[PDB]
Amino acid sequence: SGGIERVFTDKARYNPGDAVSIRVQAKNGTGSSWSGAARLEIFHLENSVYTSSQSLSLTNGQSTTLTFTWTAPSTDFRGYFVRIDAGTLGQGATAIDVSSDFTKYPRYGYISEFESGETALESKAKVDQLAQDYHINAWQFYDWMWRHDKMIKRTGGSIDSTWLDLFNREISWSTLQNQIDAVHDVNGKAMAYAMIYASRENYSPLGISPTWGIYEDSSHTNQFDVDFGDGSTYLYMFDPQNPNWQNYIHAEYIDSINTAGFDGIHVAQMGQRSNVYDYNGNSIDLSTRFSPFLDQAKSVLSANNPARDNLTYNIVDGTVNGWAVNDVSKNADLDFLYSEIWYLSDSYNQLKNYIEQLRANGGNKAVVLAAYMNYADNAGTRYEAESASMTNVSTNTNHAGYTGSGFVDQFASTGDKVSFAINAPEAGDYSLVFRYGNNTGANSTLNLYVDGNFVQKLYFFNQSSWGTWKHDAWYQVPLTQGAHTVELRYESGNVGAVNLDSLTLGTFDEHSVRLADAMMSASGATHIELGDDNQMLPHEYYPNRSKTMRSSLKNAMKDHYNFITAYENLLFDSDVVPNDTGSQFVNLTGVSASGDGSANTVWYINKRTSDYNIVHLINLLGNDNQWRNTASQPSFQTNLPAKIYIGADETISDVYLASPDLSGGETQELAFTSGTDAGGKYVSFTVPELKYWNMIYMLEH
Ligand SMILES: OC[C@H]1O[C@H](OC[C@H]2O[C@H](OC[C@H]3O[C@H](OC[C@H]4O[C@@H](O)[C@H](O)[C@@H](O)[C@@H]4O)[C@H](O)[C@@H](O)[C@@H]3O)[C@H](O)[C@@H](O)[C@@H]2O)[C@H](O)[C@@H](O)[C@@H]1O
Ligand SMILES: OC[C@H]1O[C@H](OC[C@H]2O[C@H](OC[C@H]3O[C@H](OC[C@H]4O[C@H](O)[C@H](O)[C@@H](O)[C@@H]4O)[C@H](O)[C@@H](O)[C@@H]3O)[C@H](O)[C@@H](O)[C@@H]2O)[C@H](O)[C@@H](O)[C@@H]1O
Ligand SMILES: [Ca+2]
Ligand code: NA
């Protein structure tokens, strides 16, 4: 098997003029010798712009790697599709982005691990995989810093080679510096995460004054804080418009750029706080105070280094006219916009409208969303704990909300054990996720053994009652294909007790993820969801690996990111705008349609540039209108008729459709007819295949 195994480029973005080196990795699986050619074609949208061929002979079972050189055309900010054809050996694809500045088309990843064991080679590997497979061109470095108010730890004037972060992880300077070097190698940019307004506890001896702080009340009595739950460890919050706090923390931003080599600062925040005072007791609206900080930030960064002055800011809890949404997106000197969605834009449609507001408020600046998929779902293959092998503990049913036929109780003493026999369909990482109850008044622990080896002590959090199930006890392990044993053991020095409901191989649901990303991108945004060593982002604490992508979803992602890179001019460009105004329409014979992402339908979103009329179809057949929750496989459709009404205005030369779902997102020309109905001007064609997302672009001349 295989054929064309990988297609990718040495770097994630290129400048105009750069030599671009397309690699193609091929392997003959057909138990025979093979001789033929591999043909390279590169398109800018509908138009072929380079073609080339190389002869290829391979014995039975032989692998090789071809290289095709290309030069990036001098028009800046253009994306290209890439096809490789090898006849009977197979085909493949990738995409190329020619853009001098990543902030126009951000494809944002992350890094959250900085382990000392990590070699420069491993660091390059993780960066290289994301850059090659998805064209990630910027990375958010998460929880790299020592302290929030002192990001680089020094002993005298000497940088400490390792340090411990607020959750006691060991951060390595050299690992960090290697990863940054690697990001740069692929023409990546590196964004340091940093708060706008946070110090850590016991701040006064770092010369920070409480008089710079924000307060819950007007007697300067309680400083807004963030409590990490151990009585020691806190963030304290400060006034973004205070000139001393700006002075202090912008000097840290700069230290970070200049010492670590970052290309900018990803500024975070906690979200909405109400009834906010300064030290002196003047009531203040915290939501208008971020962009004066950000303006000042931008200006001291651009003065320090125009090449490394990138800036974004987390608009937390995003939604149409959400807190700080308007002030930030309209008045902050940010290179691009960023927003963490929680529960105010739960429908595909609501989230579309938020993206549109953002894109409109910012002057078609790029928007990136953080939106952790399947966040509330225990998604993946479930193994009931009542159906496993348990010792000195028995099943029960006497507390509601379990899955299956019950759960294992009284898992409270030495020698108690539960063994699950699981199958791993493919070698890879697996998130072992346990659903459980704990009402002992504290944290509870068990020891986790895989195939007879201990792997980690595991914490089970205390809860409001034994009626209440959580599933935030997990650990991620590598596994070979085939059978394995996963075992929890109550041993010596384990504490508390738990009811165990089940084990789950925490898995992102391909269906929901494909839909969510098509929506986001048709709407005009990107999604930060990939990082470290091909992990997908399950939670706001980025080191969290309670879900894993299986290979089926990895491939769809490679397709998705190929797609949004080749078609970035049609998806993201400065002049790409909705057609919401007017009153347009689309008809699909056989299937319901909607313009507002209604449940169990197909969804048209109509957009335009001056060159093209664009309609995205997104297949919500068989699924609700919520973007985040898991979903069923939608009803794929074949040879489906459509008619798109337009205006008396438009004349349409050709019709084109590309989809990540089909031939890796290559563009097909479609046959079609024109004319007029009672409803108005119209055009018509058969959509050969709709799976999750088709984009229809129709050339207007
Ligand atoms: O205690 C059990 C708990 O453990 C893990 O979660 C840990 C916590 O993650 C988050 O808080 C840590 C986070 O706090 C600040 O950032 C918050 C937030 O900032 C936003 O702007 C940004 O978009 C987010 O990415 C970021 O999380 C600090 O600035 C940051 O340095 C620090 O990393 C979360 O808010 C807390 O709720 C969690 O306790 C497990 O992953 C989890 O399952 C478990 O419940
Ligand atoms: O302060 C005294 C102790 O308090 C805590 O003890 C908690 C218990 O932990 C385990 O039980 C887990 C179990 O808890 C409930 O059962 C409550 C009672 O219900 C029945 O009467 C049962 O037959 C009794 O044994 C039990 O007391 C849940 O309903 C059940 O689903 C859970 O699995 C131990 O088995 C108990 O002996 C503990 O009391 C705290 O953990 C201790 O430190 C304190 O000693
Ligand atoms: Ca169960
Ligand atoms: Na859904």
From Swiss-Prot:
<keyword id="KW-0732">Signal</keyword>
<dbReference type="GO" id="GO:0016757">
    <property type="term" value="F:glycosyltransferase activity"/>
</dbReference>
<comment type="similarity">
    <text>Belongs to the glycosyl hydrolase 66 family.</text>
</comment>
<keyword id="KW-0677">Repeat</keyword>
<protein>
    <recommendedName>
        <fullName>Cycloisomaltooligosaccharide glucanotransferase</fullName>
        <ecNumber>2.4.1.248</ecNumber>
    </recommendedName>
</protein>
<dbReference type="GO" id="GO:0030246">
    <property type="term" value="F:carbohydrate binding"/>
</dbReference>
<feature type="domain" description="CBM6 1">
    <location>
        <begin position="381"/>
        <end position="506"/>
    </location>
</feature>
<comment type="subunit">
    <text>Monomer.</text>
</comment>
<keyword id="KW-0328">Glycosyltransferase</keyword>
<comment type="function">
    <text>Produces cycloisomaltooligosaccharide from dextran containing 7, 8 or 9 glucose units. The enzyme is specific for (1-&gt;6)-alpha-D-glucans (dextrans) and, without activity toward (1-&gt;4)-alpha-D-glucans, such as amylose. It also has no activity on oligosaccharides, such as amylopectin and pullulan, containing (1-&gt;6)-alpha-D-glucosidic linkages at branch points.</text>
</comment>
<keyword id="KW-0808">Transferase</keyword>
